[PDB]
Amino acid sequence: AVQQNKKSRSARDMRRSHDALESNALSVEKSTGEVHLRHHVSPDGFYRGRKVV
Amino acid sequence: MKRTFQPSTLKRARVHGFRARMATKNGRQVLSRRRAKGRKRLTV
Amino acid sequence: MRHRKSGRHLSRTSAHRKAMFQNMAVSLFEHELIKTTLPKAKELRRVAEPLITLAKEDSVANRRLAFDRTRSKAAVGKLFNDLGKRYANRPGGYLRILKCGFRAGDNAPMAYVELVDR
Amino acid sequence: EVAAKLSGARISAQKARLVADQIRGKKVGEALNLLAFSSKKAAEIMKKVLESAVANAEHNEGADVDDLKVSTVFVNEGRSLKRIMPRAKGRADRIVKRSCHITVKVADK
Amino acid sequence: ARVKRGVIARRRHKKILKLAKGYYGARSRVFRVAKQAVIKAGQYAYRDRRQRKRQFRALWIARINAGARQNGLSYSRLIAGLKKAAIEIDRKVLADLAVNEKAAFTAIVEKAKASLA
RNA sequence: AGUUGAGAAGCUUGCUGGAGGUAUCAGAAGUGCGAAUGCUGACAUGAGUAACGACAAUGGGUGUGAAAAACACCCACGCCGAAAGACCAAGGGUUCCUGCGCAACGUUAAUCGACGCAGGGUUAGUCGGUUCCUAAGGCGAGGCUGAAAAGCGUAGUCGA
RNA sequence: AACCCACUCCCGUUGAAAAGGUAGGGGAUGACUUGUGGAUCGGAGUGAAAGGCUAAUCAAGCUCGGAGAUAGCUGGUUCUC
RNA sequence: GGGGAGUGAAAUAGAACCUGAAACCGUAUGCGUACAAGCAGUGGGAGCCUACUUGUUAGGUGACUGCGUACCUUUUGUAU
RNA sequence: GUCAAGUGAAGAAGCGCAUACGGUGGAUGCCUUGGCAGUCAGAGGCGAUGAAAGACGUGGUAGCCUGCGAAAAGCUUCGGG
């Protein structure tokens, strides 16, 4: 089951009009002052004003 | 699924070797063709 | 359709789950903090916490009911002597789960699972 | 306006323009936060390229990192590598291992 | 005298691709499709130097019809009355006077009604 | 880009390029490409889709690292066990080991490797071969035969 | 049982596999299976015979030549008025 | 792998290195595109945007609208 | 001011066209240490004094070419430079 015509630029790009990205769930610790994911331990091991690791 | 090349160095050298080619008239002219073409091996 | 159906398959047989979960229980009772995937952390808390609740009471029946489902002598000794006298006045929730980024090779969402008074 | 370029990144261009579309026009610290927490390979690569562009602006000019804005990101295509995957019934197919060229162009406008 | 034909083939393809620019997709950028689109544009343009003279005449006739009916006359009665008289004035400037100079067009339709056709 | 011709086309110029070009009129042609399921290279589309190679099975800890699901070690879990274990012939030909490495190769990553670079490692009177002997079969002084090439063969002498 | 085979289903058909896998199946002290070496070859071999096999090729292998065979057939044949 | 600095007449001659076309893939700017049905053009045509210097111009888009079933080859005949 | 009716400019997930810069890619131009075809000459063979064609060695670094041959990128003599 193949195409009978190659697809154009336009329809190729309209297909991929949906596959753009997001990850905006960042936040800053009040204690240390660094960015980390929401609800996640910091890359320097802090979580809600406390070192955990 | 057994394949068609089953290697043996003795059967190699006795069918296609140097002395087998130089035993017969036609193998001597195999070597002279294959030497006239300029080949590096000439006994395979 | 899994309406109201607990437990998760984790791409495994049931015996594989049982081995992996009592391994993680034993490893958490020795180290008190391990590092694992977030769904295996969500399913460890249903295996590992009844063992501590069982360990809050010293009986021979309790220590070989612990032993047949955490089958290592060292974790039955770590329970009933350390974890179970510590957690004797806490009504559940003996371990917490803290999400910690993603694994580098996959994107497996990672979590730390930690005994609460460590 | 200061560039940094990676000529030949072992990701393909279509996969890298996804992350390239995601930092374009942003502030540099915002862009570094986005790239440092993204789930992808192109963000590791493009974060290293953005670090290089920023440090080029710090050392070859006098711009502060707070002033800088990532102004032009574009991913061109690099030289592919041409390899064989053996398939069934004796048939061989060509794999192209695509590469790409990442250019981050930081500026203070 | 071996003669290498890649320098003239290029200029002939540039000429065809320049004539094809503004077109959709491969109609403007690959030669075997741009060539057909340029030939087809040429046929339509030949045909439409004719249909231009057909289409403007109908628009003039429709505007003269609309202007003459405001003064109580058809198009066809107007064209008949402008030949019971002798006006030798065409559909183009009558449509222009129908839109722009309406009193002059009213004078023309009254001299057609004056010839009672 | 402009411009001039009915056309093939011509002419003038901005940028690029950085060493050749050929008014005119003649001579000569490997003289003009869109098609030949045309040849050869590059690159599309399908599509970031299908797959990633038996459904023995993995989970933590610790280290190293720029970075570890995958390397190493520890703890534990499974799997083979007339083999998924040890070994000899054949075939291969350095793949073996140790340092350093990770571009490419490895259907992912790799700090690991049957991969790259450089070094080292293979010790025999007794184990295998040569050497001694012959089987099938080969070759074969002379010899019989055959347009020639050669065929067959005696003495012989190779051949495990 | 090993080993040798290949009757059935299902899968697979762009395969893990240019003929397999898993379940079952036939022979399994013989007209058996197999290693190593050797012999027979292209109107020519070998064949418990099917046009089977003779290097994934077989109603006449492969390769190189005659050779640019031949084709009343098919396809194509390039700038301008 | 780059950003400078140097060499060089020239490094967008930097070693995959003279020139560096087309296919194909991008980023930026302008304009048009989410009530509209088909070989994607062509005739008409508003609007907008740039250069000019303004106008009865030049370039770019082209809402809307009339007509409009590619090219080849073969055929009595092909959008087929 | 309110309420009706009429009318409709921006606001593009993405696309299209033009333009300008890029990337890929190797055409084109120019170039040649390689070929091709003749003319005029040569000398028409080499080998049991071991050939053509090779294998292995040969160097301070040492792989492969090219020379050499355990005297091994060379040895002895004449001659030229």
PDB file of all heavy atoms in Angstrom, chain F residues 18-29:
ATOM      1  P     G F  18      39.049  32.740  -6.734  1.00  0.00           P
ATOM      2  OP1   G F  18      38.883  31.837  -5.587  1.00  0.00           O
ATOM      3  OP2   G F  18      39.187  34.183  -6.509  1.00  0.00           O
ATOM      4  O5'   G F  18      40.307  32.254  -7.569  1.00  0.00           O
ATOM      5  C5'   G F  18      40.155  31.687  -8.869  1.00  0.00           C
ATOM      6  C4'   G F  18      40.833  32.483  -9.962  1.00  0.00           C
ATOM      7  O4'   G F  18      40.069  33.669 -10.258  1.00  0.00           O
ATOM      8  C3'   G F  18      42.254  32.965  -9.690  1.00  0.00           C
ATOM      9  O3'   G F  18      42.941  33.047 -10.919  1.00  0.00           O
ATOM     10  C2'   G F  18      42.043  34.399  -9.276  1.00  0.00           C
ATOM     11  O2'   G F  18      43.168  35.219  -9.485  1.00  0.00           O
ATOM     12  C1'   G F  18      40.907  34.790 -10.196  1.00  0.00           C
ATOM     13  N9    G F  18      40.156  35.942  -9.731  1.00  0.00           N
ATOM     14  C8    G F  18      39.987  36.415  -8.472  1.00  0.00           C
ATOM     15  N7    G F  18      39.290  37.510  -8.417  1.00  0.00           N
ATOM     16  C5    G F  18      39.011  37.785  -9.731  1.00  0.00           C
ATOM     17  C6    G F  18      38.317  38.828 -10.338  1.00  0.00           C
ATOM     18  O6    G F  18      37.756  39.780  -9.814  1.00  0.00           O
ATOM     19  N1    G F  18      38.287  38.691 -11.710  1.00  0.00           N
ATOM     20  C2    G F  18      38.867  37.683 -12.418  1.00  0.00           C
ATOM     21  N2    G F  18      38.737  37.700 -13.734  1.00  0.00           N
ATOM     22  N3    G F  18      39.511  36.706 -11.866  1.00  0.00           N
ATOM     23  C4    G F  18      39.544  36.828 -10.542  1.00  0.00           C
ATOM     24  P     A F  19      43.794  31.844 -11.500  1.00  0.00           P
ATOM     25  OP1   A F  19      43.458  30.571 -10.851  1.00  0.00           O
ATOM     26  OP2   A F  19      45.191  32.275 -11.506  1.00  0.00           O
ATOM     27  O5'   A F  19      43.309  31.802 -12.996  1.00  0.00           O
ATOM     28  C5'   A F  19      43.416  30.626 -13.764  1.00  0.00           C
ATOM     29  C4'   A F  19      43.515  30.961 -15.220  1.00  0.00           C
ATOM     30  O4'   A F  19      42.743  32.151 -15.498  1.00  0.00           O
ATOM     31  C3'   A F  19      44.915  31.245 -15.725  1.00  0.00           C
ATOM     32  O3'   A F  19      44.967  30.918 -17.095  1.00  0.00           O
ATOM     33  C2'   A F  19      44.978  32.756 -15.648  1.00  0.00           C
ATOM     34  O2'   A F  19      45.939  33.343 -16.488  1.00  0.00           O
ATOM     35  C1'   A F  19      43.573  33.121 -16.083  1.00  0.00           C
ATOM     36  N9    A F  19      43.140  34.419 -15.597  1.00  0.00           N
ATOM     37  C8    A F  19      42.901  34.735 -14.302  1.00  0.00           C
ATOM     38  N7    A F  19      42.534  35.954 -14.119  1.00  0.00           N
ATOM     39  C5    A F  19      42.498  36.465 -15.388  1.00  0.00           C
ATOM     40  C6    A F  19      42.152  37.720 -15.868  1.00  0.00           C
ATOM     41  N6    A F  19      41.791  38.707 -15.085  1.00  0.00           N
ATOM     42  N1    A F  19      42.213  37.930 -17.190  1.00  0.00           N
ATOM     43  C2    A F  19      42.592  36.926 -17.979  1.00  0.00           C
ATOM     44  N3    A F  19      42.939  35.703 -17.631  1.00  0.00           N
ATOM     45  C4    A F  19      42.853  35.537 -16.313  1.00  0.00           C
ATOM     46  P     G F  20      45.141  29.429 -17.625  1.00  0.00           P
ATOM     47  OP1   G F  20      44.071  28.520 -17.209  1.00  0.00           O
ATOM     48  OP2   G F  20      46.550  29.053 -17.465  1.00  0.00           O
ATOM     49  O5'   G F  20      44.866  29.654 -19.165  1.00  0.00           O
ATOM     50  C5'   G F  20      43.609  29.351 -19.748  1.00  0.00           C
ATOM     51  C4'   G F  20      42.596  30.469 -19.669  1.00  0.00           C
ATOM     52  O4'   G F  20      43.201  31.712 -19.236  1.00  0.00           O
ATOM     53  C3'   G F  20      41.904  30.853 -20.961  1.00  0.00           C
ATOM     54  O3'   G F  20      40.908  29.929 -21.358  1.00  0.00           O
ATOM     55  C2'   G F  20      41.360  32.232 -20.627  1.00  0.00           C
ATOM     56  O2'   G F  20      40.223  32.120 -19.802  1.00  0.00           O
ATOM     57  C1'   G F  20      42.494  32.808 -19.785  1.00  0.00           C
ATOM     58  N9    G F  20      43.423  33.589 -20.621  1.00  0.00           N
ATOM     59  C8    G F  20      44.723  33.272 -20.816  1.00  0.00           C
ATOM     60  N7    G F  20      45.330  34.068 -21.626  1.00  0.00           N
ATOM     61  C5    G F  20      44.374  34.968 -22.003  1.00  0.00           C
ATOM     62  C6    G F  20      44.459  36.060 -22.876  1.00  0.00           C
ATOM     63  O6    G F  20      45.434  36.464 -23.498  1.00  0.00           O
ATOM     64  N1    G F  20      43.258  36.726 -22.988  1.00  0.00           N
ATOM     65  C2    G F  20      42.128  36.375 -22.343  1.00  0.00           C
ATOM     66  N2    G F  20      41.054  37.115 -22.559  1.00  0.00           N
ATOM     67  N3    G F  20      42.037  35.364 -21.532  1.00  0.00           N
ATOM     68  C4    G F  20      43.190  34.696 -21.395  1.00  0.00           C
ATOM     69  P     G F  21      40.797  29.407 -22.868  1.00  0.00           P
ATOM     70  OP1   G F  21      40.183  28.073 -22.872  1.00  0.00           O
ATOM     71  OP2   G F  21      42.076  29.593 -23.558  1.00  0.00           O
ATOM     72  O5'   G F  21      39.795  30.425 -23.547  1.00  0.00           O
ATOM     73  C5'   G F  21      38.647  30.887 -22.860  1.00  0.00           C
ATOM     74  C4'   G F  21      38.191  32.227 -23.374  1.00  0.00           C
ATOM     75  O4'   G F  21      39.196  33.228 -23.106  1.00  0.00           O
ATOM     76  C3'   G F  21      37.983  32.330 -24.867  1.00  0.00           C
ATOM     77  O3'   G F  21      36.766  31.759 -25.296  1.00  0.00           O
ATOM     78  C2'   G F  21      38.080  33.828 -25.102  1.00  0.00           C
ATOM     79  O2'   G F  21      36.884  34.475 -24.710  1.00  0.00           O
ATOM     80  C1'   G F  21      39.157  34.220 -24.106  1.00  0.00           C
ATOM     81  N9    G F  21      40.493  34.362 -24.704  1.00  0.00           N
ATOM     82  C8    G F  21      41.566  33.589 -24.403  1.00  0.00           C
ATOM     83  N7    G F  21      42.631  33.922 -25.047  1.00  0.00           N
ATOM     84  C5    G F  21      42.238  34.995 -25.810  1.00  0.00           C
ATOM     85  C6    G F  21      42.973  35.772 -26.714  1.00  0.00           C
ATOM     86  O6    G F  21      44.160  35.661 -27.016  1.00  0.00           O
ATOM     87  N1    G F  21      42.210  36.761 -27.290  1.00  0.00           N
ATOM     88  C2    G F  21      40.904  36.973 -27.021  1.00  0.00           C
ATOM     89  N2    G F  21      40.313  37.972 -27.660  1.00  0.00           N
ATOM     90  N3    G F  21      40.213  36.256 -26.178  1.00  0.00           N
ATOM     91  C4    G F  21      40.930  35.287 -25.607  1.00  0.00           C
ATOM     92  P     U F  22      36.676  30.984 -26.693  1.00  0.00           P
ATOM     93  OP1   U F  22      35.331  30.407 -26.755  1.00  0.00           O
ATOM     94  OP2   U F  22      37.834  30.089 -26.867  1.00  0.00           O
ATOM     95  O5'   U F  22      36.733  32.135 -27.779  1.00  0.00           O
ATOM     96  C5'   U F  22      35.732  33.150 -27.848  1.00  0.00           C
ATOM     97  C4'   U F  22      36.121  34.253 -28.803  1.00  0.00           C
ATOM     98  O4'   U F  22      37.485  34.660 -28.522  1.00  0.00           O
ATOM     99  C3'   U F  22      36.083  33.878 -30.282  1.00  0.00           C
ATOM    100  O3'   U F  22      35.699  34.996 -31.067  1.00  0.00           O
ATOM    101  C2'   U F  22      37.532  33.553 -30.587  1.00  0.00           C
ATOM    102  O2'   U F  22      37.892  33.691 -31.943  1.00  0.00           O
ATOM    103  C1'   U F  22      38.270  34.538 -29.686  1.00  0.00           C
ATOM    104  N1    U F  22      39.587  34.033 -29.298  1.00  0.00           N
ATOM    105  C2    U F  22      40.689  34.715 -29.704  1.00  0.00           C
ATOM    106  O2    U F  22      40.619  35.737 -30.332  1.00  0.00           O
ATOM    107  N3    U F  22      41.865  34.143 -29.360  1.00  0.00           N
ATOM    108  C4    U F  22      42.041  32.993 -28.651  1.00  0.00           C
ATOM    109  O4    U F  22      43.173  32.608 -28.410  1.00  0.00           O
ATOM    110  C5    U F  22      40.853  32.328 -28.277  1.00  0.00           C
ATOM    111  C6    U F  22      39.694  32.856 -28.623  1.00  0.00           C
ATOM    112  P     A F  23      34.588  34.831 -32.208  1.00  0.00           P
ATOM    113  OP1   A F  23      33.500  33.973 -31.700  1.00  0.00           O
ATOM    114  OP2   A F  23      35.272  34.411 -33.440  1.00  0.00           O
ATOM    115  O5'   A F  23      34.061  36.315 -32.404  1.00  0.00           O
ATOM    116  C5'   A F  23      34.958  37.390 -32.197  1.00  0.00           C
ATOM    117  C4'   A F  23      34.402  38.718 -32.628  1.00  0.00           C
ATOM    118  O4'   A F  23      35.509  39.608 -32.896  1.00  0.00           O
ATOM    119  C3'   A F  23      33.594  38.726 -33.913  1.00  0.00           C
ATOM    120  O3'   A F  23      32.238  38.397 -33.685  1.00  0.00           O
ATOM    121  C2'   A F  23      33.784  40.147 -34.421  1.00  0.00           C
ATOM    122  O2'   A F  23      32.912  41.044 -33.751  1.00  0.00           O
ATOM    123  C1'   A F  23      35.205  40.447 -33.980  1.00  0.00           C
ATOM    124  N9    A F  23      36.201  40.294 -35.062  1.00  0.00           N
ATOM    125  C8    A F  23      36.299  41.116 -36.157  1.00  0.00           C
ATOM    126  N7    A F  23      37.261  40.823 -36.990  1.00  0.00           N
ATOM    127  C5    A F  23      37.845  39.732 -36.405  1.00  0.00           C
ATOM    128  C6    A F  23      38.917  38.948 -36.799  1.00  0.00           C
ATOM    129  N6    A F  23      39.630  39.130 -37.903  1.00  0.00           N
ATOM    130  N1    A F  23      39.241  37.939 -35.995  1.00  0.00           N
ATOM    131  C2    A F  23      38.550  37.723 -34.873  1.00  0.00           C
ATOM    132  N3    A F  23      37.523  38.366 -34.411  1.00  0.00           N
ATOM    133  C4    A F  23      37.209  39.375 -35.227  1.00  0.00           C
ATOM    134  P     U F  24      31.321  37.735 -34.823  1.00  0.00           P
ATOM    135  OP1   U F  24      30.032  38.455 -34.800  1.00  0.00           O
ATOM    136  OP2   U F  24      31.312  36.271 -34.655  1.00  0.00           O
ATOM    137  O5'   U F  24      32.061  38.044 -36.190  1.00  0.00           O
ATOM    138  C5'   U F  24      31.571  39.044 -37.066  1.00  0.00           C
ATOM    139  C4'   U F  24      32.534  39.286 -38.192  1.00  0.00           C
ATOM    140  O4'   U F  24      33.890  39.250 -37.694  1.00  0.00           O
ATOM    141  C3'   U F  24      32.515  38.239 -39.280  1.00  0.00           C
ATOM    142  O3'   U F  24      31.481  38.482 -40.207  1.00  0.00           O
ATOM    143  C2'   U F  24      33.906  38.349 -39.881  1.00  0.00           C
ATOM    144  O2'   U F  24      33.973  39.439 -40.781  1.00  0.00           O
ATOM    145  C1'   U F  24      34.746  38.702 -38.667  1.00  0.00           C
ATOM    146  N1    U F  24      35.489  37.567 -38.072  1.00  0.00           N
ATOM    147  C2    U F  24      36.649  37.129 -38.653  1.00  0.00           C
ATOM    148  O2    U F  24      37.083  37.582 -39.678  1.00  0.00           O
ATOM    149  N3    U F  24      37.293  36.115 -38.017  1.00  0.00           N
ATOM    150  C4    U F  24      36.909  35.515 -36.854  1.00  0.00           C
ATOM    151  O4    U F  24      37.578  34.614 -36.372  1.00  0.00           O
ATOM    152  C5    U F  24      35.712  36.019 -36.305  1.00  0.00           C
ATOM    153  C6    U F  24      35.072  37.002 -36.912  1.00  0.00           C
ATOM    154  P     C F  25      30.346  37.388 -40.464  1.00  0.00           P
ATOM    155  OP1   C F  25      29.187  38.098 -41.038  1.00  0.00           O
ATOM    156  OP2   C F  25      30.164  36.549 -39.273  1.00  0.00           O
ATOM    157  O5'   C F  25      30.978  36.498 -41.613  1.00  0.00           O
ATOM    158  C5'   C F  25      31.367  37.097 -42.838  1.00  0.00           C
ATOM    159  C4'   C F  25      32.575  36.435 -43.436  1.00  0.00           C
ATOM    160  O4'   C F  25      33.688  36.508 -42.519  1.00  0.00           O
ATOM    161  C3'   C F  25      32.446  34.960 -43.728  1.00  0.00           C
ATOM    162  O3'   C F  25      31.744  34.705 -44.924  1.00  0.00           O
ATOM    163  C2'   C F  25      33.896  34.509 -43.764  1.00  0.00           C
ATOM    164  O2'   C F  25      34.486  34.840 -45.006  1.00  0.00           O
ATOM    165  C1'   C F  25      34.523  35.388 -42.688  1.00  0.00           C
ATOM    166  N1    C F  25      34.689  34.695 -41.390  1.00  0.00           N
ATOM    167  C2    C F  25      35.836  33.952 -41.183  1.00  0.00           C
ATOM    168  O2    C F  25      36.661  33.890 -42.079  1.00  0.00           O
ATOM    169  N3    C F  25      36.004  33.311 -40.026  1.00  0.00           N
ATOM    170  C4    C F  25      35.093  33.418 -39.079  1.00  0.00           C
ATOM    171  N4    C F  25      35.299  32.771 -37.952  1.00  0.00           N
ATOM    172  C5    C F  25      33.909  34.172 -39.237  1.00  0.00           C
ATOM    173  C6    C F  25      33.753  34.784 -40.405  1.00  0.00           C
ATOM    174  P     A F  26      30.820  33.408 -45.058  1.00  0.00           P
ATOM    175  OP1   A F  26      29.769  33.679 -46.054  1.00  0.00           O
ATOM    176  OP2   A F  26      30.446  32.947 -43.712  1.00  0.00           O
ATOM    177  O5'   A F  26      31.799  32.316 -45.654  1.00  0.00           O
ATOM    178  C5'   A F  26      32.256  31.259 -44.841  1.00  0.00           C
ATOM    179  C4'   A F  26      33.635  30.804 -45.224  1.00  0.00           C
ATOM    180  O4'   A F  26      34.601  31.455 -44.367  1.00  0.00           O
ATOM    181  C3'   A F  26      33.877  29.332 -44.994  1.00  0.00           C
ATOM    182  O3'   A F  26      33.432  28.538 -46.069  1.00  0.00           O
ATOM    183  C2'   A F  26      35.368  29.276 -44.727  1.00  0.00           C
ATOM    184  O2'   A F  26      36.094  29.422 -45.932  1.00  0.00           O
ATOM    185  C1'   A F  26      35.551  30.532 -43.911  1.00  0.00           C
ATOM    186  N9    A F  26      35.292  30.326 -42.474  1.00  0.00           N
ATOM    187  C8    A F  26      34.257  30.849 -41.767  1.00  0.00           C
ATOM    188  N7    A F  26      34.256  30.540 -40.501  1.00  0.00           N
ATOM    189  C5    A F  26      35.377  29.750 -40.369  1.00  0.00           C
ATOM    190  C6    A F  26      35.936  29.073 -39.289  1.00  0.00           C
ATOM    191  N6    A F  26      35.432  29.121 -38.062  1.00  0.00           N
ATOM    192  N1    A F  26      37.054  28.376 -39.496  1.00  0.00           N
ATOM    193  C2    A F  26      37.574  28.326 -40.723  1.00  0.00           C
ATOM    194  N3    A F  26      37.132  28.916 -41.818  1.00  0.00           N
ATOM    195  C4    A F  26      36.017  29.604 -41.579  1.00  0.00           C
ATOM    196  P     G F  27      33.131  26.995 -45.821  1.00  0.00           P
ATOM    197  OP1   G F  27      32.351  26.443 -46.935  1.00  0.00           O
ATOM    198  OP2   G F  27      32.576  26.904 -44.460  1.00  0.00           O
ATOM    199  O5'   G F  27      34.582  26.364 -45.851  1.00  0.00           O
ATOM    200  C5'   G F  27      34.778  24.977 -45.862  1.00  0.00           C
ATOM    201  C4'   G F  27      35.960  24.601 -45.024  1.00  0.00           C
ATOM    202  O4'   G F  27      36.293  25.677 -44.122  1.00  0.00           O
ATOM    203  C3'   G F  27      35.722  23.441 -44.099  1.00  0.00           C
ATOM    204  O3'   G F  27      35.739  22.198 -44.748  1.00  0.00           O
ATOM    205  C2'   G F  27      36.806  23.633 -43.071  1.00  0.00           C
ATOM    206  O2'   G F  27      38.064  23.319 -43.629  1.00  0.00           O
ATOM    207  C1'   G F  27      36.749  25.139 -42.898  1.00  0.00           C
ATOM    208  N9    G F  27      35.834  25.561 -41.817  1.00  0.00           N
ATOM    209  C8    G F  27      34.758  26.387 -41.915  1.00  0.00           C
ATOM    210  N7    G F  27      34.131  26.597 -40.804  1.00  0.00           N
ATOM    211  C5    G F  27      34.857  25.892 -39.878  1.00  0.00           C
ATOM    212  C6    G F  27      34.672  25.730 -38.486  1.00  0.00           C
ATOM    213  O6    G F  27      33.838  26.195 -37.713  1.00  0.00           O
ATOM    214  N1    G F  27      35.631  24.920 -37.948  1.00  0.00           N
ATOM    215  C2    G F  27      36.618  24.332 -38.655  1.00  0.00           C
ATOM    216  N2    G F  27      37.468  23.555 -38.014  1.00  0.00           N
ATOM    217  N3    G F  27      36.805  24.466 -39.926  1.00  0.00           N
ATOM    218  C4    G F  27      35.895  25.246 -40.495  1.00  0.00           C
ATOM    219  P     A F  28      34.378  21.384 -44.829  1.00  0.00           P
ATOM    220  OP1   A F  28      34.521  20.485 -45.989  1.00  0.00           O
ATOM    221  OP2   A F  28      33.230  22.296 -44.706  1.00  0.00           O
ATOM    222  O5'   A F  28      34.395  20.534 -43.497  1.00  0.00           O
ATOM    223  C5'   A F  28      35.567  19.836 -43.143  1.00  0.00           C
ATOM    224  C4'   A F  28      35.758  19.720 -41.655  1.00  0.00           C
ATOM    225  O4'   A F  28      35.661  20.994 -40.992  1.00  0.00           O
ATOM    226  C3'   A F  28      34.773  18.867 -40.902  1.00  0.00           C
ATOM    227  O3'   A F  28      35.000  17.495 -41.108  1.00  0.00           O
ATOM    228  C2'   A F  28      35.009  19.301 -39.465  1.00  0.00           C
ATOM    229  O2'   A F  28      36.162  18.668 -38.949  1.00  0.00           O
ATOM    230  C1'   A F  28      35.338  20.775 -39.637  1.00  0.00           C
ATOM    231  N9    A F  28      34.276  21.685 -39.198  1.00  0.00           N
ATOM    232  C8    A F  28      33.445  22.462 -39.939  1.00  0.00           C
ATOM    233  N7    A F  28      32.652  23.199 -39.211  1.00  0.00           N
ATOM    234  C5    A F  28      32.987  22.878 -37.922  1.00  0.00           C
ATOM    235  C6    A F  28      32.520  23.314 -36.702  1.00  0.00           C
ATOM    236  N6    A F  28      31.560  24.207 -36.571  1.00  0.00           N
ATOM    237  N1    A F  28      33.054  22.802 -35.589  1.00  0.00           N
ATOM    238  C2    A F  28      34.013  21.895 -35.698  1.00  0.00           C
ATOM    239  N3    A F  28      34.549  21.419 -36.804  1.00  0.00           N
ATOM    240  C4    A F  28      33.983  21.951 -37.895  1.00  0.00           C
ATOM    241  P     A F  29      33.758  16.501 -41.191  1.00  0.00           P
ATOM    242  OP1   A F  29      34.319  15.137 -41.118  1.00  0.00           O
ATOM    243  OP2   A F  29      32.901  16.900 -42.327  1.00  0.00           O
ATOM    244  O5'   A F  29      32.933  16.834 -39.881  1.00  0.00           O
ATOM    245  C5'   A F  29      32.818  15.882 -38.844  1.00  0.00           C
ATOM    246  C4'   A F  29      33.110  16.466 -37.494  1.00  0.00           C
ATOM    247  O4'   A F  29      32.806  17.887 -37.463  1.00  0.00           O
ATOM    248  C3'   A F  29      32.286  15.843 -36.382  1.00  0.00           C
ATOM    249  O3'   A F  29      33.047  15.853 -35.184  1.00  0.00           O
ATOM    250  C2'   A F  29      31.161  16.842 -36.213  1.00  0.00           C
ATOM    251  O2'   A F  29      30.510  16.769 -34.964  1.00  0.00           O
ATOM    252  C1'   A F  29      31.926  18.139 -36.396  1.00  0.00           C
ATOM    253  N9    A F  29      31.114  19.313 -36.693  1.00  0.00           N
ATOM    254  C8    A F  29      30.665  19.793 -37.883  1.00  0.00           C
ATOM    255  N7    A F  29      29.949  20.881 -37.760  1.00  0.00           N
ATOM    256  C5    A F  29      29.950  21.116 -36.406  1.00  0.00           C
ATOM    257  C6    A F  29      29.370  22.099 -35.622  1.00  0.00           C
ATOM    258  N6    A F  29      28.650  23.096 -36.115  1.00  0.00           N
ATOM    259  N1    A F  29      29.564  22.017 -34.298  1.00  0.00           N
ATOM    260  C2    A F  29      30.298  21.024 -33.791  1.00  0.00           C
ATOM    261  N3    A F  29      30.879  20.042 -34.431  1.00  0.00           N
ATOM    262  C4    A F  29      30.667  20.163 -35.740  1.00  0.00           C
TER     263        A F  29
END
